[PDB]
Amino acid sequence: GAMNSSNYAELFNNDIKLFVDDTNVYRVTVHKTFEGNVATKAINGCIFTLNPKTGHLFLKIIHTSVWAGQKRLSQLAKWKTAEEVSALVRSLPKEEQPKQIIVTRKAMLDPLEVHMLDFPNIAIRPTELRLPFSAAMSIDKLSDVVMKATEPQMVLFNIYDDWLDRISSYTAFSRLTLLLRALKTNEESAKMILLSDPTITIKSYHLWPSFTDEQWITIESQMRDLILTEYGRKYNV
Amino acid sequence: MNTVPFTSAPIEVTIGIDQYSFNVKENQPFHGIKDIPIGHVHVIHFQHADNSSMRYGYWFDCRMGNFYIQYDPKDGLYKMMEERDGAKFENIVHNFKERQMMVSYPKIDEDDTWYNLTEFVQMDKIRKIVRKDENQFSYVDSSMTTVQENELSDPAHSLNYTVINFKSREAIRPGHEMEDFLDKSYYLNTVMLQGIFKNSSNYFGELQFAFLNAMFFGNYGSSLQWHAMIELICSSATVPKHMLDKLDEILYYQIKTLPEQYSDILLNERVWNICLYSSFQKNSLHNTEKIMENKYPELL
Numbered sequence: 001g002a003m004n005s006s007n008y009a010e011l012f013n014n015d016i017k018l019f020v021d022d023t024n025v026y027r028v029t030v031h032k033t034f035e036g037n038v039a040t041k042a043i044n045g046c047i048f049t050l051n052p053k054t055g056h057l058f059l060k061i062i063h064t065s066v067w068a069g070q071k072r073l074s075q076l077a078k079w080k081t082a083e084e085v086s087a088l089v090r091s092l093p094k095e096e097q098p099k100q101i102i103v104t105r106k107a108m109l110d111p112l113e114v115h116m117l118d119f120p121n122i123a124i125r126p127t128e129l130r131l132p133f134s135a136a137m138s139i140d141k142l143s144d145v146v147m148k149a150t151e152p153q154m155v156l157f158n159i160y161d162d163w164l165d166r167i168s169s170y171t172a173f174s175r176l177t178l179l180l181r182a183l184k185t186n187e188e189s190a191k192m193i194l195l196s197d198p199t200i201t202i203k204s205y206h207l208w209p210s211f212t213d214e215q216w217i218t219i220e221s222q223m224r225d226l227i228l229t230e231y232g233r234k235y236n237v
Numbered sequence: 238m239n240t241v242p243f244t245s246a247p248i249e250v251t252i253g254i255d256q257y258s259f260n261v262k263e264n265q266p267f268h269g270i271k272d273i274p275i276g277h278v279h280v281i282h283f284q285h286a287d288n289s290s291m292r293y294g295y296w297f298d299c300r301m302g303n304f305y306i307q308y309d310p311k312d313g314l315y316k317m318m319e320e321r322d323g324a325k326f327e328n329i330v331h332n333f334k335e336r337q338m339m340v341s342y343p344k345i346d347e348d349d350t351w352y353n354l355t356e357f358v359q360m361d362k363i364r365k366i367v368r369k370d371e372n373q374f375s376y377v378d379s380s381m382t383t384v385q386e387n388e389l390s391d392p393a394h395s396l397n398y399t400v401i402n403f404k405s406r407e408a409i410r411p412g413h414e415m416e417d418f419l420d421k422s423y424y425l426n427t428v429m430l431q432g433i434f435k436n437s438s439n440y441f442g443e444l445q446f447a448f449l450n451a452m453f454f455g456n457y458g459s460s461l462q463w464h465a466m467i468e469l470i471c472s473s474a475t476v477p478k479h480m481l482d483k484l485d486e487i488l489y490y491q492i493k494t495l496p497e498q499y500s501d502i503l504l505n506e507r508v509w510n511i512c513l514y515s516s517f518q519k520n521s522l523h524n525t526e527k528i529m530e531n532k533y534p535e536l537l
């Protein structure tokens with residue numbers, strides 16, 4: 001069934017699963033036209049496909065050429081996401097294929113189910129969680145590869161960097177969702193927290209700074225405080 | 238004009254004959270129904286007074302044999318039987334008629350309702366949905382499940398309606414996933430009409446039979462099938478104009494005849510709102526839209 005807080009530890013069992021987030025597939029800027037009307041202009045997007053146990057991120061970059069000449073782009077984007085996720089699953093060896101795919105938005109269920117009819121043994125499931133994966137484009141190395149792409153492309157990342165050498169997947173996923181929740185609620189403040197000290201470096205093959213264990217405790221406390229506040233600064237409490 | 242003789246009426250029962258019904262009391266002198274129009278299928282159906290559970294009945298065509306009803310006290314139902322002694326039949330019928338022991342099929346001359354509801358229904362296709370080949374007539378009741386339903390338990394007692402499944406490989410061509418899901422014309426016109434039903438009359442006949450089983454027996458799988466076959470046409474952008482015009486007429490007479498106090502369980506809000514107001518055919522069902530808005534505006 002749907003994924004929620006009751007069955008949250010299932011993410012870290014040994015059944016291969018992928019999260020699919022489509023929030024950043026179809027992205028536009030809205031602007032005025034010469035005649036004073038409004039138009040959109042697409043920018044490059046991405047499918048965020050994540051294994052939460054291993055950290056493996058399959059980032060399919062969606063180049064603006066895919067929208068050229070198409071109509072109903074918000075609807076097309078869900079089907080394009082489903083086509084690319086299905087193509088990803090087809091390209092994998094059988095023992096690497098997911099047993100479940102969890103979509104972050106329920107509107108993805110029918111497109112994915114239809115594109116995955118050939119995989120009756122792969123469960124497509126929604127979630128009740130309000131996961132912050134839309135903030136993936138606030139990760140500078142991710143935003144960069146997307147924006148620079150001149151053609152469709154798949155890039156592979158580990159969104160946990162090397163953390164799993166020291167912490168469990170459960171803890172790594174909690175750290176990630178904390179970082180992403182912060183970036184979503186107040187990107188400027190969250191980025192200030194991560195990059196306030198330019199002495200601490202991001203490894204060329206990483207997405208996040210190389211914090212020591214004790215700096216991570218500090219960072220995570222600063223991220224909680226941010227999220228606590230912005231929830232006040234918004235509800236006045 | 239044909240007859241359905243009843244041996245007797247040993248248990249109190251509401252008897253339906255097509256869209257008409259009447260009450261018969263326990264051991265009332267009652268020996269059946271006369272003046273039944275030739276040229277249509279018919280259904281004779283039963284609701285016992287003691288048990289409003291199990292509505293059941295028999296689809297038949299008076300051109301296919303001499304049929305009478307006899308109560309079975311073992312199985313506890315009124316059974317349809319075929320009399321192969323044609324002179325025994327005529328002679329009993331003549332005696333019942335002389336004693337005026339039969340109710341008359343009360344068709345008003347202006348009234349085309351039954352024709353309009355059964356226009357495309359044929360016995361030979363009923364007998365393929367309801368498999369019991371030793372009988373020229375077909376038993377249906379409230380509890381019978383459909384083949385599709387049994388895939389999600391006794392196969393002999395199933396309604397073998399044509400399986401429609403929008404999220405199936407049958408319905409979705411590889412490489413046309415979005416296209417075939419949002420516009421089902423491929424599935425309607427090539428897979429179903431050309432491939433399985435062969436023509437639209439057979440499609441409409443099964444659609445009408447499913448509705449009638451839903452309405453007369455409360456058969457849930459039948460109601461599912463009726464809505465599925467409506468939805469398949471409404472969700473197709475390319476439908477022959479002659480099919481659309483006939484669908485409008487078909488649904489109009491179904492909606493007109495539905496018992497008003499049954500619309501809550503028999504009408505699927507989602508399917509109807511999609512067909513009348515969102516689908517490709519939102520503008521093609523004028524008569525159906527107008528009766529739906531004046532009779533069941535709550536649903537919409």
Ligand SMILES: COC(=O)c1n[nH]c(C)c1Br
Binds near residue numbers: 243244305325326330
């Ligand atoms: C055979 O038993 C019967 O009762 C019967 N046979 N024909 C008709 C008209 C009837 Br009633």
